[PDB]
Structure 1
Amino acid sequence: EFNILLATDSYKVTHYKQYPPNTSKVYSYFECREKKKYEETVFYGLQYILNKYLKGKVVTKEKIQEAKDVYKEHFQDDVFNEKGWNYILEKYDGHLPIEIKAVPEGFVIPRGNVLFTVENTDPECYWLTNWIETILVQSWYPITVATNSREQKKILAKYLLETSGNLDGLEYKLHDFGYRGVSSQETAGIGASAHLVNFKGTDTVAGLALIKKYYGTKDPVPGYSVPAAEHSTITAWGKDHEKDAFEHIVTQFSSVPVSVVSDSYDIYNACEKIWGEDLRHLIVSRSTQAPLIIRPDSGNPLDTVLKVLEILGKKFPVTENSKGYKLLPPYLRVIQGDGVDINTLQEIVEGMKQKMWSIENIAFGSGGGLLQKLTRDLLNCSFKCSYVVTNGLGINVFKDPVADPNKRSKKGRLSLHRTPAGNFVTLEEGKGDLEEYGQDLLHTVFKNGKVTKSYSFDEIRKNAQLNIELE
C-alpha cells in the first residue's frame, strides 16, 4: 500500500530540524517559471494527485512504524519525525492539516504566475508544507503533456485553417501512440489523460479509466480509436503475401475506418502497385465514413509523407479545394506515426502546404514525442517557499542566486488576478489583500484532508480551448 511517509525526497525527512525555531507557518507556491517557446501553460492534473494520494486518512500507526524502520536503515541514523506524524494521526485522525489553493483546471496561464499554493493549517505541522513538495511537483508532467499537446493543436489548427478554410477534424489530428513508450503504467494513464484535454484520439487505453475515476465526462468515454494493422499482422502472411494481408484486413474492416501500415517491405511499391493498382477496387468502393488510412512508418517523415501523397495523387482522383489545395478522395487518407514531435509536426505540415497538399489529408500519431520526451525543465515547473511566520511575525522569503536571475523566486503571500486588459498577474507580498485587482483566481481545492472543489473533464476541456476554436 502507498505510504505518504515514504513518498518524499529522503532529505526532506531531516528538514523539521532545520527551519528557524518558533516557526508556525510555511507557505509555498508552484509556478512554471519564466525563462529569459511555451509562453502559456495548461494547468491540469492536481485533482488526480489530491484524490489518489493526499486525501482522507493517509497516516496510520502501521505507516509510521514502517517509515521509522525504513529510515533507520536508509539513513543509518534515527532522524525521522515520529512525533510530528503521531500528532497528525492523533489530532486529525491521520488527515493532513494542509490547505491548497489552485487555479481552475484547464485554465491557460502565462509563464511566471502562481498556479497553486500550499500551507499548513496547524502550527505544529509547519514542516508538512514542504514534505509534500515532491509529490505535488509531479503535477509538472500532466501540465507539460497538456501544454505541449495544445501547442501542437495550435500548429495543426493554423495549417488546417489555411489549407481548408475550417477546423473540421482538428480534434482527431494528433493521436496518442505513447503507451509502450512511457516509463510506467501509471504514467501512461496520467499522460494520456492530459493529451485528451486537447484531442479525442488515443490508443493509450489507460487514460480512459483515470478520467472516469478522477474527473468524469458526460459522454461514456473521453477518447476513441479505430481498427488498424501492426507490422505483425502484415508480416505474419509471409513476405510474398503482403497484398493478401492488405486485402484480408480491409475486407475484415470494410465498413469502419481502418488504418494499414504499408512500409513492411517497400512503402512506395505498396502505395503505387498494391493499393494503387492491385487492390484499388477495394479502396474506391469505401464509404466516406470508412476510409482506408495508409500509414507509412519509416524514412524521413517529411520526405516520405510527400512522396506517399504524390504517389496516391497519381493513382486516385484528387480534387482541388476552395483554397487551392489538393485533396485525396474521401475514402483515402494518410497517417504519419513515426518520429512525430512538435518540431517534426511543424516541418511536415509546412512542407505539405508548400507542395499544395491540404492538411485535411493527414493525421499524426505521436508516442514518445507526446508522452515521454518532456522534462520538468521545459516549463521550469517549480515549488518554492515564499512566506513563513516565526515568533508570530510574517516574513517574505525567496531565493535569488547571484549567477542566475532566472531562478529568483516570488516573495510573500501570493494571489492571481485578472489585469484591466484581461491578462493575468501574480501579486506578491500579500498585495492581493489591498483589493485593487478584483478577486483572487486561486480557489481552495484541498483543506485538512478533504478535496473541497473539483472539476469535470468536460469543464477542463472548455477551459483549455484554443482562441481560434473560440473564434
Structure 2
Amino acid sequence: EFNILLATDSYKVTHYKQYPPNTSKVYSYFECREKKYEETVFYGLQYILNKYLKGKVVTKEKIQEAKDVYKEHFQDDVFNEKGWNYILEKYDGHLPIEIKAVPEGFVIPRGNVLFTVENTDPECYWLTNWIETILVQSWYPITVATNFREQKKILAKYLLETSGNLDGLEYKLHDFGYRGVSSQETAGIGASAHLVNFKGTDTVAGLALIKKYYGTKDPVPGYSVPAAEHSTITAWGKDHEKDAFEHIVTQFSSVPVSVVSDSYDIYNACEKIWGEDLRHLIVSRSTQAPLIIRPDSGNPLDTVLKVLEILGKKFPVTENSKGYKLLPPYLRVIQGDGVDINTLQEIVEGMKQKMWSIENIAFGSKLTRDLLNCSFKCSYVVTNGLGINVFKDPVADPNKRSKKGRLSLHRTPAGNFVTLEEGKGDLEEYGQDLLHTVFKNGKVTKSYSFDEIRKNAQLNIELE
C-alpha cells in the first residue's frame, strides 16, 4: 500500500531542521516557467489529490514503516517522527494543507501561477515542501494534454482547409502509446490527458482512471474499432497475406476495420491485393464500415503520399467542394509510425501540397518536465510572525528566477491572465483571484468532471 511518508525525495526528510527557527508558514507555487508551447492545459492535479493526498494518509503503521526505512536509508536517525505523529493525533492523519488551483482543463499562458500550497497548521511548516515531489509529477498530464492540444490545432487547421469543416477531428489522432510508456500507472494518466483532446484510444487504462477520478456523462470517454496487428497477418505465412486480409475483412464486414499492410510490401499490398485481388470485398462495404489501410514503415510522409497515389488509381476518387481529392467512403488510411508533432505537420502539409484531403487520413501516436519548465518553488514564509517574500535568482540563469511572495491569478482589462506577486492581489486593482481552493485539511473541496475539462480545453476554432 502507498505511504505518503515514503513518497518524497530523500533529502526532504531532513528539511524540517533547516528552515529558520520559529517558521510557522511555508507557501509555495507551481508554474510552467516562461523562457512553441506558449499556453498550457492545466490538467491532472485532481487525480493526485484524490489518489494520494486526501483522507487519512497517516497511520501508526505508516509512521513506523518510514522510521524503519529511513533509519537504514540514512544510516542514522533523522526522520521527523514527532511531526508526523502530530498530524496523526491532531488531525486523524489528514494533511493540514491548503491548495488553490486554476480549474482543470484551463488553457493558460506560460509563467502564470497554476497552483499554490501552504500549511494550515504552524506546526506543519515543513509539510508544504514535503509533498513537492508528488505534486510536481503533475507536469506529466499537463505536458501530455498540452502537446496533444497543439497537435489537434494542426489537424484542425488542415482538415478545415482541405474539407471546409471539422467533422471527425476528435478521431484524427488515436492513442497507440500503451506499450511505449514506462508503467501501467503512467499509461492511465497519459491516456486520460490524451482523452482531454481526442476520443479514439487503444490505451484502455485511461477509461477506468477517468471514470474513477473525473466522470463522464457517457458510459466511456474513449472508443476504438477492430484492427489487425502484424502477428495476425504474418501467422498465415508469407505466401498467404491475401488469405489473411480476406479473412479479417470478412470477419469484420459490417464494422470499421484497420489492417496493417506493410508486413512484406506495402506498395504491392495496396496496388495488387487490396487494389485488385480483394477489391470486390472493399467496394461493397458500408460508409459506416470502411477499410482503413495502415502503412507502418518507411519515411512517413513519402509512404503516406505513395499509398494515397496507389489507392487513388485503383479506387474511385472524388474531388470535394474545396478541390481536394477524397477516397470513397469505404476506404481510409491511418499512419501511426513516426508520428510526433513535427512529422504530423510535415505529413498534412505534404498531403495538402499534393491536393489530398485530410479527410482521408488519421494518425496514431519523449516529453519531459523541461519542455514547459514545470516547477515548484517557495515564494513566501512567516518566521517570528513576520511574513517575508522569498525567491531564487541565480546569477548565471535569469530564466530560473522564481516569483516572490503571495500569489494570485487575475483577469486583465483585455481579458487575459496575469499573475500578481508580493500579495498585490489584495490591492483589489485586478478584481478577484481566479484560483480556487481545491484541497483543504484532507478534503478535496472543488473538482471537475471530465466533460467540463474537455470543454475548458477546446480550441478557439472549435468554439467557432
Task: With the length of structure 1 as denominator, give the TM-score of the two structures.
Answer: 0.98
Does residue 310 of structure 1 match 2:309? yes
SS in 2 for 1:293: strand
Per-residue deviation, residues 134-183 of structure 1 (Å, max 9, x unmatched): 00000000000000000000000000011101000000000000000000
Per-residue deviation, residues 302-335 of structure 1 (Å, max 9, x unmatched): 0000000000000000011111111100100000
SS in 2 for 1:152: helix
CA–CA distance in 2 between the matches of 1:78 and 1:353?
A: 66
Q: Percent of counterpart pairs with the same letter? A: 100
SS in 1 for 2:377: strand
Per-residue deviation, residues 33-62 of structure 1 (Å, max 9, x unmatched): 00x310000000000000000000000010
Per-residue deviation, residues 55-75 of structure 1 (Å, max 9, x unmatched): 000000100010000001000
The aligned counterpart of 2:351 is 352
Deviation at 1:29, TM superposition (A): 0.1
Per-residue deviation, residues 92-124 of structure 1 (Å, max 9, x unmatched): 000000000000000000000000000000000
CA–CA distance in 1 between the matches of 2:399 and 2:392?
A: 11
Deviation at 1:387, TM superposition (A): 0.3
SS in 2 for 1:469: coil
CA–CA distance in 1 between the matches of 2:302 and 2:411?
A: 46
Does residue 123 of structure 1 match 2:122? yes
Deviation at 1:345, TM superposition (A): 0.5
Equivalent in 383, 395, 401 of residue 390 of structure 1: 383
Per-residue deviation, residues 4-23 of structure 1 (Å, max 9, x unmatched): 00000000000000000110
Per-residue deviation, residues 162-208 of structure 1 (Å, max 9, x unmatched): 11010000000000000000000000000000000000000000000
Per-residue deviation, residues 366-397 of structure 1 (Å, max 9, x unmatched): 1xxxxxx1100000000000000011011000
Per-residue deviation, residues 264-292 of structure 1 (Å, max 9, x unmatched): 00000000000000000000011111100
CA–CA distance in 2 between the matches of 1:320 and 1:302?
A: 22
CA–CA distance in 2 between the matches of 1:264 and 1:61?
A: 58
The aligned counterpart of 1:369 is none
CA–CA distance in 1 between the matches of 2:339 and 2:291?
A: 21
CA–CA distance in 2 between the matches of 1:258 and 1:441?
A: 46
CA–CA distance in 1 between the matches of 2:76 and 2:342?
A: 49
CA–CA distance in 2 between the matches of 1:299 and 1:29?
A: 46
SS in 2 for 1:294: strand
Per-residue deviation, residues 242-268 of structure 1 (Å, max 9, x unmatched): 000000000000001000000000000
CA–CA distance in 1 between the matches of 2:283 and 2:121?
A: 70
The aligned counterpart of 1:101 is 100
- Matches of residues 372-387 of structure 1 in structure 2 within 5 Å? 373-387=366-380
CA–CA distance in 1 between the matches of 2:458 and 2:170?
A: 11
CA–CA distance in 1 between the matches of 2:193 and 2:251?
A: 33
The aligned counterpart of 1:449 is 442
Deviation at 1:438, TM superposition (A): 1.4
CA–CA distance in 1 between the matches of 2:381 and 2:458?
A: 37
- Matches of residues 125-164 of structure 1 in structure 2 within 5 Å? 125-164=124-163
Per-residue deviation, residues 412-438 of structure 1 (Å, max 9, x unmatched): 000001111111000000011111111
CA–CA distance in 1 between the matches of 2:383 and 2:92?
A: 27
CA–CA distance in 1 between the matches of 2:428 and 2:205?
A: 44
CA–CA distance in 2 between the matches of 1:257 and 1:419?
A: 48
The aligned counterpart of 2:5 is 5
SS in 2 for 1:180: helix
SS in 2 for 1:402: coil
Per-residue deviation, residues 209-251 of structure 1 (Å, max 9, x unmatched): 0000000000000000000000000000000000000000000
Aligned CA-pair RMSD: 0.4
CA–CA distance in 2 between the matches of 1:235 and 1:439?
A: 62
Aligned length: 464
Deviation at 1:439, TM superposition (A): 1.2
The aligned counterpart of 2:326 is 327
